Amino acid sequence: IHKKFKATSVGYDWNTFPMKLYQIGKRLFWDPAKIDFSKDKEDWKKLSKDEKNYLLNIVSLFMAGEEAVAVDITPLISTMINEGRVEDVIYLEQFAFEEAKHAEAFRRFCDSLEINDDLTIFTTEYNPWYQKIFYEELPSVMWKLRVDPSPENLAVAVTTYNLYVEGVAAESGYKTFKHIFNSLNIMPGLSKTVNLIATDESRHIAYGTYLITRLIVENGESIYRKAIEQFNKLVGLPFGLTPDFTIENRKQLVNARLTVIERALKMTPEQVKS
Amino acid sequence: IHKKFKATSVGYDWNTFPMKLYQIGKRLFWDPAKIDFSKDKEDWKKLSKDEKNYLLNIVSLFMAGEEAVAVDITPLISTMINEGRVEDVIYLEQFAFEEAKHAEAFRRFCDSLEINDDLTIFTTEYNPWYQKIFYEELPSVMWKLRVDPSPENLAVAVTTYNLYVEGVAAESGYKTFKHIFNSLNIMPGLSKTVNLIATDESRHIAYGTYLITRLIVENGESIYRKAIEQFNKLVGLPFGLTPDFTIENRKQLVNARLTVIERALKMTPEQVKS
Ligand SMILES: [Fe+3]
Ligand SMILES: [Fe+3]
Ligand SMILES: [Mn+3]
Ligand SMILES: [Mn+3]
Numbered sequence: 001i002h003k004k005f006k007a008t009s010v011g012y013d014w015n016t017f018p019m020k021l022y023q024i025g026k027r028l029f030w031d032p033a034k035i036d037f038s039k040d041k042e043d044w045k046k047l048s049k050d051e052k053n054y055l056l057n058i059v060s061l062f063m064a065g066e067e068a069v070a071v072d073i074t075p076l077i078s079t080m081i082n083e084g085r086v087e088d089v090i091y092l093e094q095f096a097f098e099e100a101k102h103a104e105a106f107r108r109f110c111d112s113l114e115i116n117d118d119l120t121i122f123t124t125e126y127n128p129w130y131q132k133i134f135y136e137e138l139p140s141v142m143w144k145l146r147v148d149p150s151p152e153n154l155a156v157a158v159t160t161y162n163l164y165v166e167g168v169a170a171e172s173g174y175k176t177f178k179h180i181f182n183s184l185n186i187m188p189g190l191s192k193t194v195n196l197i198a199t200d201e202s203r204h205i206a207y208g209t210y211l212i213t214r215l216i217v218e219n220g221e222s223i224y225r226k227a228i229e230q231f232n233k234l235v236g237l238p239f240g241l242t243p244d245f246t247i248e249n250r251k252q253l254v255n256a257r258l259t260v261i262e263r264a265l266k267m268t269p270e271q272v273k274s
Numbered sequence: 275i276h277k278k279f280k281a282t283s284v285g286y287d288w289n290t291f292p293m294k295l296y297q298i299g300k301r302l303f304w305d306p307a308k309i310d311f312s313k314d315k316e317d318w319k320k321l322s323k324d325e326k327n328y329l330l331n332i333v334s335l336f337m338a339g340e341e342a343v344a345v346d347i348t349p350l351i352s353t354m355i356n357e358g359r360v361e362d363v364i365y366l367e368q369f370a371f372e373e374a375k376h377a378e379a380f381r382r383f384c385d386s387l388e389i390n391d392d393l394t395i396f397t398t399e400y401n402p403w404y405q406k407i408f409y410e411e412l413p414s415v416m417w418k419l420r421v422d423p424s425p426e427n428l429a430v431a432v433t434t435y436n437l438y439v440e441g442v443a444a445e446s447g448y449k450t451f452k453h454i455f456n457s458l459n460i461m462p463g464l465s466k467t468v469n470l471i472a473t474d475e476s477r478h479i480a481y482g483t484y485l486i487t488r489l490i491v492e493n494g495e496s497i498y499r500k501a502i503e504q505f506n507k508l509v510g511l512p513f514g515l516t517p518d519f520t521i522e523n524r525k526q527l528v529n530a531r532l533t534v535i536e537r538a539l540k541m542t543p544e545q546v547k548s
Pocket of ligand 3: 066098099102170197201
């Protein structure tokens with residue numbers, strides 16, 4: 001409709017959280033082209049058949065997700081347009097630029113390893129939980145904002161997107177990447193890639209926290225129940241990795257999100273919003 | 275719906291035009307924070323009352339537009355999601371990141387000049403053509419893709435967005451900025467800003483050309499008539515500037531777009547698409 005421009009009259013609120021993360025994003029901008037993968041292909045040929053299978057599996061998980069989160073961001077951006085929160089639109093529009101840049105980096109790392117075949121037999125067949133969330137849950141909750149931009153749908157969207165996918169699932173793979181790169185002294189180019197992607201996820205989960213906490217302070221009693229119901233619905237080895245350890249961290253990250261969610265309760269909207 | 279990921283199976287087409295501009299965008303990335311505005315405020319106090327009025331006017335025009343083009347990009351991105359063109363989604367999602375970064379740079383330049391008042395009395399009252407296009411035309415044609423993602427609406431959208439707004443209107447202000455900064459030796463910080471924004475518009479009009487030419491090669495007979503009807507509907511001093519000269523360039527840029535539009539006619543889809 002464009003009845004009034006928030007940049008001409010009221011201006012930009014530079015002290016807001018989505019704008020301060022918007023500064024750090026362009027302050028710590030990194031180019032995947034500068035990341036050299038010329039030695040990763042040598043370390044790829046020095047790994048066993050099973051270690052290459054699990055590494056290709058977890059890389060296929062992120063690369064599948066980086067594209068999905070880059071195209072499911074559209075209803076959240078359009079919802080913020082209908083909400084008039086241009087500052088959120090400015091970051092959420094960058095918040096996807098780092099996501100699309102992540103999908104490029106993994107595809108760059110895959111093409112650097114001569115990997116020219118299909119990786120769909122990793123996103124569905126080997127782990128159906130990754131099919132349930134990204135093929136069914138994430139498209140349903142995000143694109144529900146297109147037809148219903150209600151606050152309760154925003155909470156259901158952000159929890160299925162910034163809390164579990166980015167704060168729990170994406171971070172668990174980073175800790176999995178932490179024990180693969182540091183213990184074996186392999187994949188320095190992907191290590192530079194992950195350390196730059198994990199740095200982006202720091203601002204990604206930060207705004208996701210700010211968005212969900214903003215809903216638990218504007219509609220605390222109703223948003224919290226939907227944000228927890230959705231978070232309870234989502235939750236329902238080589239390289240020297242223990243299966244009881246990765247599950248411990250992903251449950252430790254799940255516990256790390258329940259704290260920051262309930263932290264928003266009984267908080268004044270002045271303490272987080274403007 | 276997320277029935278199939280274009281990044282897991284078929285992969286990314288790195289040789290396509292939206293991906294090659296996606297490389298240059300992150301290759302020539304510039305941070306508006308590094309641009310120093312400490313001497314622009316000194317040159318602002320050395321301009322007459324009318325020269326400051328026209329400079330603030332044309333700056334208020336871009337800053338108003340940079341926000342509008344950053345929030346009207348959402349239907350075009352969602353249309354490319356429904357079209358499955360993830361490569362276009364990757365650039366169009368960056369293509370807005372440079373736009374939101376432009377809206378920041380102008381607001382940074384305005385805040386650097388102590389300009390703390392409203393600029394709405396420049397986007398509507400002084401020039402109603404800027405009200406007709408950005409308050410009525412651009413929201414209508416872009417958000418018509420949300421309800422109707424037809425090829426004819428894409429042409430009407432891109433012409434009202436990448437052809438006249440970015441290729442003609444935005445470029446005319448750059449040529450206007452060309453005669454203001456070079457003839458008077460003023461505003462070096464904004465000169466660094468414009469030269470970096472005009473460099474971004476090079477990739478912006480390039481993809482806009484690629485998108486509209488792709489429609490004139492996939493549906494040449496129907497898209498061209500709508501792309502021209504819309505382009506004919508859109509078209510319907512201080513600093514040593516001549517009113518007959520800026521109109522000459524904006525008509526020269528209008529003529530520069532009719533050539534590249536009709537250039538797409540009688541061209542094989544193999545010559546531009548994949
Ligand atoms: Fe993220
Ligand atoms: Fe542009
Ligand atoms: Mn990511
Ligand atoms: Mn621009």
